[PDB]
Amino acid sequence: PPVLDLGALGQDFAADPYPTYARLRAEGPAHRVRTPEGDEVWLVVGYDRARAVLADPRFSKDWRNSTTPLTEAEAALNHNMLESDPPRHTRLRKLVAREFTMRRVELLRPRVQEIVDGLVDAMLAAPDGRADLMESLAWPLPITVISELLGVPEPDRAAFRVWTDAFVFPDDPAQAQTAMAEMSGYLSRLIDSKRGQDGEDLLSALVRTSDEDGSRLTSEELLGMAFILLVAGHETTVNLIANGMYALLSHPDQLAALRADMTLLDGAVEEMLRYEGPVESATYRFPVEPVDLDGTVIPAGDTVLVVLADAHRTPERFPDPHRFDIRRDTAGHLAFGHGIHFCIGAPLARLEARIAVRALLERCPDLALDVSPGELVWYPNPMIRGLKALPIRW
Ligand code: HEM
Ligand SMILES: CC[C@H]1OC(=O)[C@H](C)C(=O)[C@@H](C)[C@@H](O[C@H]2O[C@@H](C)C[C@@H](N(C)C)[C@H]2O)[C@@H](C)C[C@@H](C)C(=O)/C=C/[C@H]1C
């Protein structure tokens, strides 16, 4: 029953997966497919079923409920909140929930604004008048913010670029596994280096919590925490900033509307999340029992991917779904997930995106793409919507 090989779909599917998902949705909610790595997974498509499944407790995130074995490098890192169910998820999330409320994140606005102002200064100083938004803004800003929060020294941040690149588009399945092993070894060394140093960063606080009471946070969960907060704190926000400006720049009429009325900025970032959000499919879910989806039963322990990208093109929920419309009703989009695993970072992601978008539009007079929208290259990863590069001009 694998009705679709995702590996045999080419850059056409990478750049525009939506017709493929829409044809699946017309048949039903759940479809067995083959990942590019040859693994069999289920896709859940359509807004209503995707939203329901994201929050449905019958779909676990704990790999003890998955029949697909974890690799050695993955098993070193899986004791994290996103790959946990209650009660473990509940305890782990409580440890950092307070750090990421909208009120605490707003205390970061001065620093974020200062980072954005600096990065945009560097861009506008270009010897030509052109730049890659990927290298000039979308990559440096989130990695800088999350590194300062988790106390990652500046010389160490370069390796995160390489590791993330190996996670998104590895040369072979081994290079991603190798990147995970190096990242885990580094994080374990970083964790130990905070001991006794009285750091005020979030990682140092977590290390102390674990050292004080292994029943509140084990050493395995401490490494899982650092990992999850750094990876999820990074590559999704990079692509929100890139995908979001690609959306504005590829729709010059909406770029003009927003530039003419910055009070639309908040809705525009929400439509940015709706229209081309960085998460194409949610992270792995495993039914704890066979689950019947309108006649399609998924066996217990199979892998289930909720295709957020298709949910956001469901016309019943988002009329004229293929139109990027910054004044559209975006209520209930799933770009941050839904349920107990809803993104803990959403206020910080939104803060970074809003400041970055505003700064580009207020300070780059005639901002425009440097290539045509169809010339842009997208990474083939079915989990992520990401641009290889974003050439711009002003
Ligand atoms: C600003 C930096 C961010 C940090 C630190 C962060 C952190 C996290 C963490 C720790 C989780 C797991 C929560 C749990 O399991 O209870 C999570 C979930 C999630 N985040 Fe974020 N996040 C960030 C930004 C983003 C962005 C920009 C997006 C995409 C628009 C995003 C999308 C998601 C989604 C979809 C999930 C749920 C995955 C699923 O249910 O399988 N996050 N995030
Ligand atoms: C929260 C939405 C983003 O997901 C993540 O960043 C989470 C925290 C994450 O780090 C994992 C889900 C990674 O996914 C894969 O990592 C591979 C190296 C191993 C793989 N295996 C178990 C099948 C799986 O865990 C993440 C590094 C994946 C890449 C593509 C990514 O950046 C995804 C981001 C969002 C889905």
Numbering used by the authors: 12 to 405
Sentences from the paper on this structure:
The H238pAcF mutation pushes away the desosamine for about 60 degrees in the structure of 5-bound PikCH238pAcF. This substrate repositioning abolishes the salt bridge between desosamine and Glu94 as observed in the PikCWT/5 complex, and rebuilds a salt bridge between desosamine and Glu85. Nevertheless, there in PikCH238pAcF/5 exists an extra hydrophobic contact between the desosamine moiety and Tyr295. Therefore, the hydrophobic interactions mediated by pAcF238, Tyr295 and the water-mediated hydrogen bond network likely make the main contribution to the increased binding affinity of PikCH238pAcF towards 5.
Cytochrome P450 PikC (CYP107L1) from Streptomyces venezuelae ATCC 15439 is an intriguing P450 monooxygenase with unusual innate substrate flexibility. In the biosynthetic pathway of methymycin/neomethymycin (1/2) and pikromycin (3, the first discovered natural ketolide), the sole P450 enzyme recognizes both 12-membered ring macrolide YC-17 (4) and 14-membered ring macrolide narbomycin as substrates. To date, it has been well known that the presence of the positively charged dialkylamino group as a substrate anchor is a prerequisite for PikC’s substrate recognition and catalytic activities. Based on a semi-rationally designed substrate binding strategy, non-canonical amino acid mutagenesis at the His238 position enables the unnatural activities of several PikC mutants towards the macrolactone precursors without any sugar appendix.
